[PDB]
């Protein structure tokens, strides 16, 4: 139909926009401590303390399968990658400090794409 073309238009153009939105924010990761998953080889223990790990390449895989529906569904990934970073890693580390660093810097970048998601529909 015309409407399922339209609304896979309306997905493709939410997807470009993400994908500028996934760029500045790994931007603010310039030691691309989020930039791959945790080493399970590495790490043996991790999901025994992370329940739903999170990266900005596994975003980046579902991204590019359309795989967000909005806005609200990737800063909830994004959310995850900060959040677990945050419970494993101990305040007074370099992994959680640069969590804090891309948390706060990323706020700016998601508070306008918010208003380019409602304004352009």
């Given at each position: 139909?015309?409407?399922?073309?339209?609304?896979?238009?309306?997905?493709?153009?939410?997807?470009?926009?993400?994908?500028?939105?996934?760029?500045?924010?790994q931007?603010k990761?310039?030691?691309?401590?989020?930039?791959?998953?945790?080493?399970?080889?590495?790490?043996?223990?991790?999901?025994?303390?992370?329940?739903?790990?999170?990266?900005?390449?596994?975003?980046?895989?579902?991204?590019?399968?359309?795989?967000?529906?909005?806005?609200?569904?990737?800063?909830?990934?994004?959310?995850?990658?900060?959040?677990n970073?945050?419970?494993?890693?101990?305040?007074?580390?370099?992994?959680?400090?640069?969590?804090?660093?891309l948390?706060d810097?990323?706020?700016?970048?998601?508070?306008?794409?918010?208003?380019?998601?409602?304004?352009?529909?």
């Amino acid at each position: 139909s015309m409407e399922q073309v339209a609304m896979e238009l309306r997905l493709t153009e939410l997807t470009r926009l993400l994908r500028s939105v996934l760029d500045q924010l790994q931007d603010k990761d310039p030691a691309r401590i989020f930039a791959q998953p945790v080493s399970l080889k590495e790490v043996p223990d991790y999901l025994d303390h992370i329940k739903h790990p999170m990266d900005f390449a596994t975003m980046r895989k579902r991204l590019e399968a359309q795989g967000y529906k909005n806005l609200h569904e990737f800063e909830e990934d994004f959310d995850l990658i900060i959040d677990n970073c945050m419970k494993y890693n101990a305040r007074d580390t370099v992994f959680y400090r640069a969590a804090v660093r891309l948390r706060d810097q990323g706020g700016v970048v998601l508070r306008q794409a918010r208003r380019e998601v409602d304004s352009i529909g």
